[PDB]
Amino acid sequence: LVQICEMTDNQSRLQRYMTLFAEQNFSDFLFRWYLEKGKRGKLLSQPASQHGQLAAFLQAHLSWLHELNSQEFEKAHRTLQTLANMETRYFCKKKTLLGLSKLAALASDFQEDVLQEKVEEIAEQEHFLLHQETLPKKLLEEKQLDLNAMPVLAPFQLIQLYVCEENKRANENDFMKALDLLEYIGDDSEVDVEELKLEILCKAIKRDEWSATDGKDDPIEATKDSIFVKVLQNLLNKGIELKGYLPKAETLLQSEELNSLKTNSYFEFSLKANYECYMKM
Amino acid sequence: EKQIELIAFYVSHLPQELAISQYAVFLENITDPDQRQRCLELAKEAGLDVASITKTVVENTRKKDAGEFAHHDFAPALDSGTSEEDRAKIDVIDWLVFDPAQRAEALKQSNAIMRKFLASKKHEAAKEVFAKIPQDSIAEIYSQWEEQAMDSALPAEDDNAIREHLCIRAYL
């Protein structure tokens, strides 16, 4: 009775005074709150902004708050990360919670070893998020997407968005980064690695535009040219088998896709020609 | 004995280093701007390196303090006030600001004074130093570097000092 009288009013000064002079009324008031789920203990039933926010102060009675009133940074980091993981509704919020989690852990008293483990497991979370963060501002206005009030992305989505017809000024870097995003996949033989490897190298020629000037071949492949100049990091002096390490790209299988686009007659003169000084490179 | 008309001749019969150091100690006592300009004209009509002299005056004034750059964990609550020794370091920059060309030294010395004022939270004093070399001081540093026929980027010191000044501006 007295506990539901203290709950219909704005007197959690009374439920504090009740728990102040009692034997075990704390273990009762919490279990009385949970049984009364949606019945008693709500701050939306009380006019919580007045003396009813003085009621809200003790009905707000918990370790997340524990950090604010006791400086338990390590505990705050664990809950902030847990909230960041369950977060699916808002991308901007998932980013904020991880930032806060990381700042809580950096400001906590973890041993340098434990701190290194926390910031490394966090660096992975920052790594996946950074993909949805780098989404091009051409496609986000084309697909009419809210800037922050919306969801994130996967290497498949990023790769496909980097190479969309909509990405108009797509240069060597956009395709290079759309071939860097192939090691971030998961289940490579299931999701088709070498199909995408072709899809991209074929739109890498469609944007080039194979033309002719006064009856002579026009090498538009200036981007295809540049991307094959960008694969080699001079790994000959890095001790890597760079010699014989371009059989990533296909050839006869490529002109199959070129036939689908109707572009075989234009580009097959310099596709092979450049594929000769790519067997010498 | 204030026998100004006689000094330049007897100094020319002595090593340059002594000419620079003695003329510098003389100019330290000159507060009047019209007399300052007249003394630089007279020095030029004679022949000392005003440029190396005024640089050396500012460096000597900077070197009088053996104050170590101590990290926050061991410096007491230092008086945030401008001391008389801080005042002397502020007023020594005027030597490099007299000549348009010395603009590089004016920038280095003003940055060093602004660093002390920013550390002391004297943002208004740092703005007054920034304004001294004028709202044009950054443009003047670039103009003087271009005039020296250097197709190269600015010295890393002067570019970092311009950046530091813009940081202090945004903060103030």
Binding site: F73, Y90, G99, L103, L106 | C167, Y171
Partner: protein, 114 residues
């Protein structure tokens, strides 16, 4: 105006406020030390002043965006905060988040989808 001017400090271009971009000069250890101290001094203070401005003007959603700015890898502002200042920032952000709940918004300042 205060919001714009404090953001010009917190979001200062090319590696952040009071950081050298050109390393091709002689190291002045006294200068580099003073710049690191001023960063630890001024940047947490600017974040707290901006929180205070946004909170008192009821821009509680923009108070929470300070967490994204402080955690940003572009400016690495999280490296200049002490453990006590970071705790105080999170407490101040929690206070702004409670005021959003009193406005019938979610803890991040979005409309609670019914």
């Amino acid at each position: 105006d205060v919001k714009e001017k404090i953001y010009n400090v917190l979001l200062f271009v090319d590696g952040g406020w009071m950081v050298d971009v050109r390393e091709d000069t002689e190291e002045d250890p006294e200068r580099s030390h003073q710049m690191v101290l001023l960063r630890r001094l001024c940047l947490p203070m600017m974040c707290f002043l901006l929180h205070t401005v946004l909170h008192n003007t009821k821009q509680y959603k923009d108070c929470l965006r300070l967490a994204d700015i402080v955690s940003s890898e572009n400016q690495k502002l999280y490296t200049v905060f002490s453990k006590t200042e970071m705790r105080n920032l999170l407490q101040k952000l929690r206070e702004s988040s409670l005021m959003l709940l009193d406005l019938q918004l979610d803890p991040l300042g979005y409309e609670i989808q019914s």
